Design an enzyme around this catalytic site. Sequence first.
Site, PDB file in Angstrom:
ATOM      1  N   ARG A  47     -16.127   1.047  18.854  1.00 21.55           N
ATOM      2  CA  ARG A  47     -15.109   1.630  17.981  1.00 21.55           C
ATOM      3  C   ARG A  47     -13.849   1.937  18.770  1.00 21.55           C
ATOM      4  NH1 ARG A  47     -14.959   6.826  17.347  1.00 21.55           N
ATOM      5  NH2 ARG A  47     -17.160   7.160  16.784  1.00 21.55           N
ATOM      6  N   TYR A  99       4.773  -3.664  -1.612  1.00 21.11           N
ATOM      7  CA  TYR A  99       3.505  -4.267  -2.018  1.00 21.11           C
ATOM      8  C   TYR A  99       2.642  -3.278  -2.798  1.00 21.11           C
ATOM      9  CZ  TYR A  99      -1.363  -5.939  -1.266  1.00 21.11           C
ATOM     10  OH  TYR A  99      -2.680  -6.331  -1.429  1.00 21.11           O
ATOM     11  N   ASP A 171       6.818  -4.461   7.668  1.00 20.05           N
ATOM     12  CA  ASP A 171       5.694  -5.269   7.223  1.00 20.05           C
ATOM     13  C   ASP A 171       6.186  -6.702   7.311  1.00 20.05           C
ATOM     14  OD1 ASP A 171       3.799  -6.767   5.762  1.00 20.05           O
ATOM     15  OD2 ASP A 171       3.240  -5.032   4.558  1.00 20.05           O
ATOM     16  N   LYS A 196      -3.409 -12.933   5.484  1.00 20.40           N
ATOM     17  CA  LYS A 196      -2.561 -13.984   4.940  1.00 20.40           C
ATOM     18  C   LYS A 196      -2.310 -15.046   6.021  1.00 20.40           C
ATOM     19  CE  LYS A 196      -2.828 -10.852   1.775  1.00 20.40           C
ATOM     20  NZ  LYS A 196      -1.686 -10.018   1.456  1.00 20.40           N
TER      21      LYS A 196
HETATM   22  O1  LIG Z   1      -0.599  -2.829 -10.146  1.00 21.89           O
HETATM   23  C1  LIG Z   1      -0.071  -2.043  -9.328  1.00 21.89           C
HETATM   24  O2  LIG Z   1      -0.589  -1.799  -8.214  1.00 21.89           O
HETATM   25  C2  LIG Z   1       1.234  -1.358  -9.685  1.00 21.89           C
HETATM   26  N1  LIG Z   1       2.354  -2.256  -9.473  1.00 21.89           N
HETATM   27  C3  LIG Z   1       2.945  -2.453  -8.293  1.00 21.89           C
HETATM   28  O3  LIG Z   1       2.931  -3.545  -7.747  1.00 21.89           O
HETATM   29  C4  LIG Z   1       3.631  -1.303  -7.585  1.00 21.89           C
HETATM   30  N2  LIG Z   1       4.412  -0.387  -8.465  1.00 21.89           N
HETATM   31  C5  LIG Z   1       4.116   0.954  -8.600  1.00 21.89           C
HETATM   32  C6  LIG Z   1       5.028   1.521  -9.472  1.00 21.89           C
HETATM   33  C7  LIG Z   1       5.939   0.493  -9.899  1.00 21.89           C
HETATM   34  C8  LIG Z   1       7.042   0.429 -10.748  1.00 21.89           C
HETATM   35  C9  LIG Z   1       7.722  -0.770 -10.947  1.00 21.89           C
HETATM   36  C10 LIG Z   1       7.289  -1.913 -10.283  1.00 21.89           C
HETATM   37 BR1  LIG Z   1       8.208  -3.543 -10.566  1.00 21.89          BR
HETATM   38  C11 LIG Z   1       6.216  -1.864  -9.447  1.00 21.89           C
HETATM   39  C12 LIG Z   1       5.526  -0.675  -9.248  1.00 21.89           C
END
Ligand SMILES: O=C(O)CNC(=O)Cn1ccc2ccc(Br)cc21
Lengths: 380, 380, 380, 380
Positions: A47, A99, A171, A196
């Site tokens: 670890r 992301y 990132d 990825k």
């Molecule tokens: O499904 C998921 O994890 C949510 N979606 C996403 O990827 C990240 N996210 C979180 C709030 C938010 C608002 C607008 C947009 Br555009 C993207 C957003």
Amino acid sequence: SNKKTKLIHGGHTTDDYTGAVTTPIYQTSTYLQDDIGDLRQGYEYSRTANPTRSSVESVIATLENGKHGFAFSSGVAAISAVVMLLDKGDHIILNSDVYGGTNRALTKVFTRFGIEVDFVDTTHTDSIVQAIRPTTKMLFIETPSNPLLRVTDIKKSAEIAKEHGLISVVDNTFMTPYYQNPLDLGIDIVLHSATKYLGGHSDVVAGLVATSDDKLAERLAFISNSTGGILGPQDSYLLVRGIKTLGLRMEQINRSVIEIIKMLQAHPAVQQVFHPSIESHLNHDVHMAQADGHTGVIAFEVKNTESAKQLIKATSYYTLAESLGAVESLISVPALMTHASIPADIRAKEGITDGLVRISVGIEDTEDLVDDLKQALDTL
Amino acid sequence: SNKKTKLIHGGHTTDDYTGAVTTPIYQTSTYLQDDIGDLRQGYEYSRTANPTRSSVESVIATLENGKHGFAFSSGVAAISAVVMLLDKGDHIILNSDVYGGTNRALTKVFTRFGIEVDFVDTTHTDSIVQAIRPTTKMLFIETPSNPLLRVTDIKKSAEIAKEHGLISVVDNTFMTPYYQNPLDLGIDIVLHSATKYLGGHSDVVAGLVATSDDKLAERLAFISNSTGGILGPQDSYLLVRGIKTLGLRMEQINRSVIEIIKMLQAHPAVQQVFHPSIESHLNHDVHMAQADGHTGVIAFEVKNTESAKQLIKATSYYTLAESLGAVESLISVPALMTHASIPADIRAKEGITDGLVRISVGIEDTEDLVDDLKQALDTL
Amino acid sequence: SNKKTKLIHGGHTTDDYTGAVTTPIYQTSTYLQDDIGDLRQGYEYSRTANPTRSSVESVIATLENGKHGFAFSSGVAAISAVVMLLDKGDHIILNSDVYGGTNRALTKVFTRFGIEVDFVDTTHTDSIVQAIRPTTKMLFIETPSNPLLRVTDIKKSAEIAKEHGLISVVDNTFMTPYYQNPLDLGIDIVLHSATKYLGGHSDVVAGLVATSDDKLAERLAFISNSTGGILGPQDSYLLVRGIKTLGLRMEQINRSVIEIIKMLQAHPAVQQVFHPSIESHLNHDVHMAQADGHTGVIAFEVKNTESAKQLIKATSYYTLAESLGAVESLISVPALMTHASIPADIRAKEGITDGLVRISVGIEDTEDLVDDLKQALDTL
Amino acid sequence: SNKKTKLIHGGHTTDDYTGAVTTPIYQTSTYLQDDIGDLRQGYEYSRTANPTRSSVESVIATLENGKHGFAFSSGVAAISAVVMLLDKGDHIILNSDVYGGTNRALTKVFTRFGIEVDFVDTTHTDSIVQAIRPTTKMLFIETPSNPLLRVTDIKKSAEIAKEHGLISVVDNTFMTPYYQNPLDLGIDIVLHSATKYLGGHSDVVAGLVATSDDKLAERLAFISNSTGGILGPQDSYLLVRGIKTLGLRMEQINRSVIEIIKMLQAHPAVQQVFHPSIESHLNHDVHMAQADGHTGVIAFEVKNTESAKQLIKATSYYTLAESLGAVESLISVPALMTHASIPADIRAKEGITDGLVRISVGIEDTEDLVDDLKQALDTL
Ligand SMILES: O=C(O)CNC(=O)Cn1ccc2ccc(Br)cc21
Ligand SMILES: O=C(O)CNC(=O)Cn1ccc2ccc(Br)cc21
Ligand SMILES: O=C(O)CNC(=O)Cn1ccc2ccc(Br)cc21
Ligand SMILES: O=C(O)CNC(=O)Cn1ccc2ccc(Br)cc21
Ligand code: NA
Ligand code: NA
Ligand code: NA
Ligand code: NA
Ligand code: NA
Ligand code: NA
Ligand code: NA
Ligand code: NA
């Protein structure tokens, strides 16, 4: 010297003992001590450190021109480790379309621990300057972002972060160390979902972190040893192995990306195309100034959901699955797969239309990928 | 039916598709979808779920008579996931001599996120009742503990926790599901460093968590998916494989433990012996009431540091290394290896004397382990 | 369609059951039967067939446009299996400079079993016609050969073999299925040391055999099942994985090969260069007619042993090790490493001079490999 | 000293370099040379030698009190390597009911290479003396044999073989080195299908060979290097790992074997039972004199095919699959699965009746295995 050579000869990926030209897989948890405290080669508990993991850590450190590498069980474990450099009451600025997994870790796990989060559109770096609070301690950016490939000026973000006493984090998953080296531009910490492009073969879930900062590295090591999101030796080995072909894969992907974009811009069934190589893309000049090539992720609009589903069904060589950076070309519909929890109107406002398709270009033949996507678009 | 049979036939450790009598190793990160959202067998991204990991998760769920299993990249990652069920401002009661890594995660990582921690001596469960604050949300106990093998009443702790609205957690590493099943005694969550007995072969670093609580399981799944400390498929496979011989190994270890303790109690160069099988050990009756056997960890006093080092050098079959639960018998000196940062006087006060030796009994021949340790003690 | 696409999408390299985009690793020896004789998916014992091995077998069958694939524990095990298609008293024609291991298997193992062997220079195919005896049953050729890269006309050899009732076999290791497909030219059996280019990463020892002939395939299956030189599942998986980048690797290797040969022909410290791309090379036209590219193996003369050793010491990116087809560029001196048992005068007569160097070009940067070798040659 | 200790501490199964307490997995094909011919640790090409394979080879050499170990890709590859010590025209004596794969290798592969084979009933060793021809060079025996567990006097066979200049070979698969050591009794070569008990977990196909004879070892090494049926590093690692619990597994299996045999002899639906522990079994005294325990393979008669199939369907803990030596108890019907090609009348004459069941006892609970088989027999 040159990048394709460094991919092969940089870092420690041989066995000093036997001369094995590949890193041995140390499927082991603990190590003999000759006397109490006396460690033969610096190892005492897997670890804390494992020699196969140490090998992949040295590879990512070398590829990013950093001094310290860290391998985690996933990209989001790397991100969580880096966020844990902060305390309750500290504040993070992230780019607004970060992301989904990153958004969810921050807004649903770490806000319960008192970390304060603000999303800002970092395509204009003065937004960062406005968002900075007295409690802000970290600036976290992806460039280019998913799924619309927004570009953020890395060097200016690093300068802002230095001036205001912030830990800067990039990132660098979408670009890889082969095209973009944030540590060279002043950034404190660079991380990757090695799930990825770096692994490259859709067979490892892993995160990698590199830094040149000795105190940040010491803190990251402490967090890794205490919260224990370490990458195992078999996955570390497969990572080292996949990285060998990173340059060849990325260059093939880039040739295909250029040609696919020409096709898409010419096709009548396609509206907008999002990619930093297009000269009308916001911060195209910035991307060219901080990177020597392109991500393989492209997004583009067809008419609606039915056309997107038809596109997927009609392609022979675009495969419907999650993730990116495979040897296979991957296809997805964000509005249905990654952003479906978001209300329809907010998706529209953010540009995640029902017919927004994301492709991740693989290493198939360029002409085959162009022709296949074009004939599928012709079925619309 | 019986335990040795359940070890072989409990849980899902075959391939339904080919009939393979062992769990296939899904060295993969992503999965084909036949239609958007349509998952062939419920898999879509390996961080979220991997079929080899799912197999080991079903094994630990079955062995602990729980409903849900979770595999993490290490024991401390399992512990961190469980602690992340709490929020800033919440309070945890732990047993006062809790595992060093656990102590360090809590007091140096999670206190920076506003988690409040109190160590109490849980060998008297009313201590728990005194320590309970209005903000207390979790009760976390190891029994028996390291290195002095203090025993805590599991059933009474579970009752206290239910009465006061606390999540109860047992670190069942030292006993394994083969001898002690905390979920059967009312505990909410049971966890393991599978790095020790369960894997059994010193070649996997891993943590396992089991629960019967659907909402706790849902939260653990969310934390695992967001912070990403997941066990990889190769290590999950080696875990499933090592667990097959758990009962045989533990029973051999126990025969040796009984005989070694007889020897140690008779030997003039040995002072105190710590193990829950000794009838004068505190809560011996409690341990016998909640467990059907014994851990392989024994601690005992020789005169001083020089005698402890001599003991290590003179044994043929006790190996100096970190960790426990190997097939090899392991030997260590806590005051030098795990508790050296603690001032000498506080070590003395806690019983971690300079000549306190910890052995972890392996699966070598009983008479060989007894005779080897005895002849080494005779050299003192 | 095109080769780089077929490398990705040809053969069965996904899991039909879960949808996993990579072949699962079936680390298993046996399979559940639902009723006596009833096999769920055709598997019953891993020596007979294993699904990971079956996956790599389907890949090599697809890449060579054959119907049947076979994976062996090494290239020489593949060769031995193919030779065991013969009986005591049968006769084989091989090309005279055949691979040392092949020469040794035939002349020291199989001659003890009554197999008769003749080496002939097949660069003129009428030599084959002269060597044919009434007992001749097999014609076995490598093209190009090691270390002097002699080229043999595959199509004419196949015709001769058909006319005379011979099993024709090509060792296609040096060219790979990416550039040369002997089954398309009438050959009965094609084989590879997958230890070299196909695996591509110096981490698998393996052999692969492909054929379109149902009776030859049935006999090969019987030999594989009876003498048991089968490739294991982990190595089969790493083979499938390495083959994905075969086209990219071979094309990079070829660009470097062209440039390195220009350099070598211009350099004063280099005498003769052996490679089928040089237009004065014997059967250059034949090679171009039966292959679409080039092996990465090049041989060339420096003055003597001291210059060869100096060359090795002075190169930064050419590594001294056995084998070929790595991602690293490899360098060796045949007269000292592979042909040292042969008397000096016979080495001279065959062209294996003391200063004959063999390089196996890797995937480093072309300019780096050219410049490094040139500066090392300049030190002579 | 004692066997269970030697299983843990005998042979080289740690890393001298790092101190890793398990053998590193050298997933590698080739090794750096510091100067031409200068090998850092004696390794130069993995087919010739691999350090993980070398580790398992040293384990089998140690466990059989031999000097040399060899690991092959399967048991039948080990057997084929050993048979290839002979030349065309040489003659082998085997015990008449030798393993089907062994019978098939000899009578269908090696007779085509001029090896002459005679099967004799070696339960009377003077049969060997009668069968010896001037051309006889090898004596190959299994004891006990499959499926009727015929016992052959090992020491007398070794004496006969020495007197007549024969290489003596024992297939020690069924007994394992834990109970029977043919090299201690004068035999030249001992071999195993490590696919069975040694690996122990149904997840490796492998063969192991041990000898004390330096010239036989040199010839075996040459054959292994030339015909290339080598075990890979991952399988070598899993072999070393499975062998650690060999003693515990075999002892559990033996306790269950004794109790199951008591049950079977008492049951009305069972006729004859075949196992060397039964005192009326032929050469029971010989087996007890040359072995310290028993194989887990038992055969017994029920009435007919329908009763055998019913037995299989009615058992909860006996699994229908090929192979033996699993952690699971396995069940089969030889007349249908291994001997179905043989005419019915010859099966009857040899004792392979339609209701002859073979069980391979696993490591489940003894009482569970006894009760399960008994209740299934009661359904007849
Ligand atoms: O499904 C998921 O994890 C949510 N979606 C996403 O990827 C990240 N996210 C979180 C709030 C938010 C608002 C607008 C947009 Br555009 C993207 C957003
Ligand atoms: O080295 C380490 O991680 C520290 N040591 C431990 O194991 C845990 N620990 C933390 C405070 C503390 C006080 C007394 C005793 Br006794 C143990 C204590
Ligand atoms: O070392 C080895 O295995 C031997 N050498 C070889 O490679 C093969 N070989 C066998 C006889 C023979 C004669 C001339 C030449 Br040129 C090569 C020959
Ligand atoms: O199926 C198979 O491989 C054949 N069967 C065997 O196991 C071996 N074998 C070969 C001839 C022969 C005669 C009698 C008996 Br009894 C067994 C025999
Ligand atoms: Na750059
Ligand atoms: Na910096
Ligand atoms: Na219990
Ligand atoms: Na409960
Ligand atoms: Na061609
Ligand atoms: Na043909
Ligand atoms: Na014995
Ligand atoms: Na002997």
